[PDB]
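Me: I hope this is not a bother. Any chance you could explain this protein sequence and its structure tokens? It all follows right here:
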Amino acid sequence: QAAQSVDQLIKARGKVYFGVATDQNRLTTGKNAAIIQANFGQVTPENSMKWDATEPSQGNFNFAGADYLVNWAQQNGKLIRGHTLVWHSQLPSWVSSITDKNTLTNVMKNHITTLMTRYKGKIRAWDVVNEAFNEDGSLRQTVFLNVIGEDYIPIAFQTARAADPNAKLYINDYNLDSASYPKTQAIVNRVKKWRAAGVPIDGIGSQTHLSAGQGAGVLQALPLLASAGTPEVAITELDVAGASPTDYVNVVNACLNVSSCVGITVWGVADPDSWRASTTPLLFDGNFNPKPAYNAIVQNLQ
């Protein structure tokens, strides 16, 4: 636990939260729970709310991990971002083998409604659709696009809104970190149009999985995302190869500069536990001590 809390300090700058990805595995080992209690104000389940975890066979839900996370969060006064309802990765084969439009539509709606209803009123935001875009800005060829069609995104969001109107409904994606990159421009254009059509998209989530030196571009990319006119944007899965203070401070400043940016979530607590551990991309080291980037964020926020 670092003495200064980045969540406390970001709240002092008028933001909603600074949070982290976690789950039962991390909360019940090492110093993760204590660090989150002290320094962070929000959690995203790193895995326990994904489709593989929650609906491994159709209509046979497994909420044990997700319930653990939600209960721990509520007990410790942490906000929750649900993650993620419709996505082509970590998707059971029973879903991806469906070829019938009505079958998949009903499956998708049931999956959304079941998860969101279980936690109704407890969740600040849901990543309803994850990774819907190709790098060129076209829509990714997934089972949902192929079998349901263009309408899968409208349907997913309309269904989500119906299940829990309190939750902020996000579309989430990576490589939205440069203002000149086709993907960033595309998601803005499509979100503007979807919203005008009546699709209830409340937020754009920018994952912000960076390599070294990519932080600087976020200063221009995040305002570009915010120009879509969603109520919120957020940095949802921040990590940075090498964890340079320069990259981390740039991403924090981008959020500070964007009125609709509600907060930042970093994708894990300690380096060894990162999905990209060998790149030591997080804010705490393998001794569970704050790294230079953590201190730099603190100092910037003060």
